[PDB]
Short mmCIF file of C-alpha atoms and ligand atoms in Angstrom, two decimals:
data_model
loop_
_atom_site.label_atom_id
_atom_site.label_comp_id
_atom_site.label_asym_id
_atom_site.label_seq_id
_atom_site.Cartn_x
_atom_site.Cartn_y
_atom_site.Cartn_z
CA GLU A 1 -198.36 106.41 70.80
CA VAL A 2 -201.80 107.76 69.72
CA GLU A 3 -202.63 111.41 69.81
CA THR A 4 -206.28 112.35 70.49
CA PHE A 5 -207.65 115.75 68.90
CA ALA A 6 -210.83 117.44 68.80
CA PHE A 7 -212.64 118.33 65.65
CA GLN A 8 -213.39 122.04 65.15
CA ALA A 9 -216.76 123.11 66.33
CA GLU A 10 -218.00 123.42 62.75
CA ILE A 11 -216.98 120.25 61.90
CA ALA A 12 -218.49 118.63 64.69
CA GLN A 13 -221.68 119.98 63.92
CA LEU A 14 -221.32 118.87 60.07
CA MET A 15 -220.80 115.46 61.28
CA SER A 16 -223.66 115.46 63.68
CA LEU A 17 -225.96 116.65 60.90
CA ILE A 18 -225.02 114.07 58.75
CA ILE A 19 -225.74 111.33 61.26
CA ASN A 20 -228.66 112.58 62.68
CA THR A 21 -230.62 114.04 59.43
CA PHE A 22 -233.21 111.57 57.78
CA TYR A 23 -232.00 111.20 54.54
CA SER A 24 -232.38 107.90 52.60
CA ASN A 25 -229.93 108.56 49.62
CA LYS A 26 -227.28 107.34 51.39
CA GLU A 27 -225.49 105.67 48.63
CA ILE A 28 -223.92 109.21 47.22
CA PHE A 29 -221.10 108.50 49.85
CA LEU A 30 -219.28 106.31 47.24
CA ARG A 31 -218.86 108.94 44.46
CA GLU A 32 -217.70 111.42 46.89
CA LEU A 33 -214.93 109.09 48.20
CA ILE A 34 -214.14 108.19 44.56
CA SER A 35 -214.15 111.86 43.41
CA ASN A 36 -211.66 112.69 46.27
CA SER A 37 -209.65 109.74 45.17
CA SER A 38 -209.61 111.04 41.53
CA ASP A 39 -208.62 114.20 42.52
CA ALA A 40 -205.27 112.96 44.64
CA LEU A 41 -204.26 111.43 41.47
CA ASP A 42 -204.63 114.09 39.33
CA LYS A 43 -202.43 116.08 41.73
CA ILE A 44 -199.64 113.60 41.85
CA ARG A 45 -199.92 113.06 37.84
CA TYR A 46 -199.43 117.01 37.47
CA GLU A 47 -196.65 117.08 39.69
CA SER A 48 -194.78 114.19 38.32
CA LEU A 49 -194.89 116.12 35.01
CA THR A 50 -192.22 118.37 36.08
CA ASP A 51 -190.58 115.80 38.49
CA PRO A 52 -190.74 112.05 37.42
CA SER A 53 -189.08 110.96 40.75
CA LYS A 54 -192.42 111.55 42.50
CA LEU A 55 -193.61 108.54 40.80
CA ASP A 56 -190.90 106.23 42.32
CA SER A 57 -193.18 105.46 45.32
CA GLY A 58 -195.21 103.76 42.61
CA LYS A 59 -196.04 104.30 38.83
CA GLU A 60 -199.67 102.96 38.87
CA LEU A 61 -202.54 105.31 39.16
CA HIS A 62 -205.78 103.36 40.16
CA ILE A 63 -208.69 102.97 42.53
CA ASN A 64 -209.54 99.82 44.34
CA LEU A 65 -212.85 99.18 46.01
CA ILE A 66 -212.43 96.34 48.57
CA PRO A 67 -215.60 94.88 50.50
CA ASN A 68 -215.21 92.30 53.65
CA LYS A 69 -218.19 90.86 54.83
CA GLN A 70 -216.43 89.29 58.09
CA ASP A 71 -215.06 92.62 58.98
CA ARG A 72 -217.79 94.73 57.60
CA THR A 73 -215.73 96.91 56.13
CA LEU A 74 -215.61 99.07 52.69
CA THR A 75 -212.37 100.04 51.73
CA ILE A 76 -211.55 102.54 48.79
CA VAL A 77 -207.60 102.59 48.04
CA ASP A 78 -206.16 104.97 45.42
CA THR A 79 -202.57 105.63 44.61
CA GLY A 80 -202.76 109.30 44.91
CA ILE A 81 -200.74 112.09 46.13
CA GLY A 82 -201.56 111.28 49.73
CA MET A 83 -201.72 113.40 52.75
CA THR A 84 -199.20 114.69 55.23
CA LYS A 85 -199.52 114.80 59.09
CA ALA A 86 -200.07 118.61 58.70
CA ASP A 87 -203.05 118.09 56.37
CA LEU A 88 -204.92 115.54 58.58
CA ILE A 89 -204.88 117.90 61.66
CA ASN A 90 -204.91 121.40 60.51
CA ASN A 91 -204.93 121.91 56.82
CA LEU A 92 -208.02 119.99 55.80
CA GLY A 93 -210.07 121.28 58.84
CA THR A 94 -208.74 124.94 57.94
CA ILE A 95 -210.35 124.57 54.32
CA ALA A 96 -213.52 122.38 55.56
CA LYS A 97 -214.34 125.08 58.00
CA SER A 98 -215.88 127.79 55.20
CA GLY A 99 -216.76 124.81 52.85
CA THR A 100 -218.91 123.55 55.99
CA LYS A 101 -220.48 126.96 56.37
CA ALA A 102 -221.46 127.54 52.67
CA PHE A 103 -222.75 123.93 52.86
CA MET A 104 -225.11 124.87 55.89
CA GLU A 105 -226.76 128.02 54.53
CA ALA A 106 -227.37 126.16 51.45
CA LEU A 107 -228.94 123.32 53.23
CA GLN A 108 -231.41 125.93 54.80
CA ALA A 109 -232.26 127.30 51.23
CA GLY A 110 -233.57 124.20 49.65
CA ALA A 111 -230.39 121.94 48.92
CA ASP A 112 -230.15 118.73 49.96
CA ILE A 113 -227.18 116.36 51.59
CA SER A 114 -226.33 115.04 48.09
CA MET A 115 -224.99 118.07 46.92
CA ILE A 116 -222.07 118.12 49.63
CA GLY A 117 -219.44 117.70 47.38
CA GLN A 118 -219.91 121.11 45.69
CA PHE A 119 -218.75 122.59 49.03
CA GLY A 120 -215.43 120.64 49.19
CA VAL A 121 -216.31 118.78 52.24
CA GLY A 122 -217.52 114.96 50.76
CA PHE A 123 -215.27 113.24 52.63
CA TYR A 124 -217.57 113.53 55.54
CA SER A 125 -220.28 111.74 53.53
CA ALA A 126 -218.49 108.58 54.72
CA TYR A 127 -220.48 109.01 57.91
CA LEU A 128 -223.58 108.25 56.24
CA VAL A 129 -222.91 104.68 56.27
CA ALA A 130 -219.83 104.33 58.55
CA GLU A 131 -219.79 104.13 62.47
CA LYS A 132 -216.13 104.47 62.11
CA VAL A 133 -213.79 105.66 59.55
CA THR A 134 -210.19 105.03 59.49
CA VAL A 135 -208.05 106.44 56.65
CA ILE A 136 -204.33 105.08 56.08
CA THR A 137 -202.42 107.79 53.97
CA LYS A 138 -198.85 108.06 52.90
CA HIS A 139 -197.24 111.37 51.08
CA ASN A 140 -194.02 111.53 49.51
CA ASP A 141 -192.67 113.97 52.09
CA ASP A 142 -193.95 112.40 55.34
CA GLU A 143 -194.31 109.02 57.21
CA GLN A 144 -197.18 106.82 56.84
CA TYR A 145 -200.08 107.91 59.18
CA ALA A 146 -203.17 106.41 60.41
CA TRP A 147 -206.33 108.46 60.89
CA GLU A 148 -209.50 107.42 62.85
CA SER A 149 -212.78 108.89 64.26
CA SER A 150 -215.92 107.47 65.21
CA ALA A 151 -217.34 111.06 65.47
CA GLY A 152 -218.22 112.46 68.89
CA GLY A 153 -215.99 115.52 68.24
CA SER A 154 -212.55 113.85 68.42
CA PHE A 155 -210.41 111.80 66.21
CA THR A 156 -207.11 110.34 66.51
CA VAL A 157 -203.52 110.23 64.61
CA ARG A 158 -200.73 107.93 64.90
CA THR A 159 -198.00 106.94 63.14
CA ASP A 160 -198.97 103.42 61.03
CA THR A 161 -196.89 100.53 61.68
CA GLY A 162 -199.20 98.01 59.27
CA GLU A 163 -198.04 97.12 55.58
CA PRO A 164 -196.47 99.78 53.99
CA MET A 165 -198.29 101.63 51.15
CA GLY A 166 -195.49 103.50 49.19
CA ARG A 167 -198.03 106.60 48.29
CA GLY A 168 -201.67 106.97 48.34
CA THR A 169 -204.65 106.95 50.42
CA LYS A 170 -206.69 104.09 51.86
CA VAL A 171 -210.22 104.75 53.25
CA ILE A 172 -211.38 101.66 55.65
CA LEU A 173 -215.48 102.54 56.08
CA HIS A 174 -216.36 100.45 59.26
CA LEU A 175 -220.34 100.15 58.09
CA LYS A 176 -223.16 100.67 60.26
CA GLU A 177 -225.37 97.39 60.91
CA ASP A 178 -228.16 98.25 58.48
CA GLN A 179 -225.74 99.35 55.71
CA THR A 180 -224.25 95.91 54.66
CA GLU A 181 -226.05 96.43 51.34
CA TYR A 182 -222.79 98.37 50.19
CA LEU A 183 -220.75 95.30 50.32
CA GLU A 184 -222.40 93.36 47.72
CA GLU A 185 -221.00 93.14 44.46
CA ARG A 186 -224.15 94.27 42.15
CA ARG A 187 -224.90 96.98 44.57
CA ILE A 188 -221.60 98.08 44.15
CA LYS A 189 -221.49 98.23 40.79
CA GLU A 190 -224.72 99.96 40.30
CA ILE A 191 -223.51 102.67 42.21
CA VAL A 192 -220.23 102.92 40.38
CA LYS A 193 -221.87 103.04 36.87
CA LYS A 194 -224.42 105.67 37.99
CA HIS A 195 -222.32 107.99 39.70
CA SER A 196 -218.74 107.41 38.74
CA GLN A 197 -219.04 105.99 34.94
CA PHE A 198 -216.56 108.77 33.65
CA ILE A 199 -213.44 108.72 36.09
CA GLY A 200 -210.31 108.65 34.23
CA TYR A 201 -208.75 106.02 36.18
CA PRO A 202 -209.17 102.39 36.34
CA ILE A 203 -211.65 101.44 39.21
CA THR A 204 -211.13 97.81 40.13
CA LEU A 205 -214.09 96.01 42.20
CA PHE A 206 -212.69 93.26 44.37
CA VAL A 207 -214.66 90.10 44.96
CA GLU A 208 -215.12 88.00 47.96
CA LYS A 209 -214.95 84.32 49.60
C1 LIG B 301 -208.99 111.85 56.68
C2 LIG B 301 -209.56 112.91 55.84
N1 LIG B 301 -209.49 112.92 54.72
C3 LIG B 301 -209.81 113.75 53.81
C4 LIG B 301 -209.82 113.33 52.31
C5 LIG B 301 -210.14 114.51 51.37
C6 LIG B 301 -210.95 115.58 51.91
N2 LIG B 301 -210.91 115.84 53.26
C7 LIG B 301 -210.51 115.01 54.07
N3 LIG B 301 -210.55 115.23 55.44
C8 LIG B 301 -210.06 114.39 56.28
C9 LIG B 301 -209.90 114.95 57.77
#
């Protein structure tokens, strides 16, 4: 069972701008996704201070970066609080509607795309380097779901039957044909050291065959 939804008009415009605008500093996508992972790990850590049972779905708080050259996918896995079904379809889109507006007015006043995180819509920067994004997430209060969108104004949501996660968010970036540089170890190491050197969580960079 696959449910197809439509992006809000303002979010579809933001994805079209990210995809069509000429902007060479594409590497900032990883800092936005890592900062997203660090935020979700902060939420579940704070919530577990008044409820240790929230860590029953996994005590470890870390971030993993998994490149795969055969699938041409870059995966950012974190053991954060996760996202519910209400989050994927309505809550994030409601919040992103005002952050997208403020992000567009700033772009017309001199700002550039790299400052997208200051408006709380940095997740969509994944479409700088990805033709399709698949997000596997699991919250303590909801089932495991699979979010997918190749832009174009629509996205899908379904109950994930794959490998269980326990708790966290898994962002799979199906990279564009000319963006395979973000699968090489030295390139990912260079980006992490330059943009995410002080993340208060262990970041493990997986290696390939
Ligand atoms: C799938 C999704 N994951 C997000 C993670 C952080 C912030 N916003 C997000 N928005 C969406 C639609």
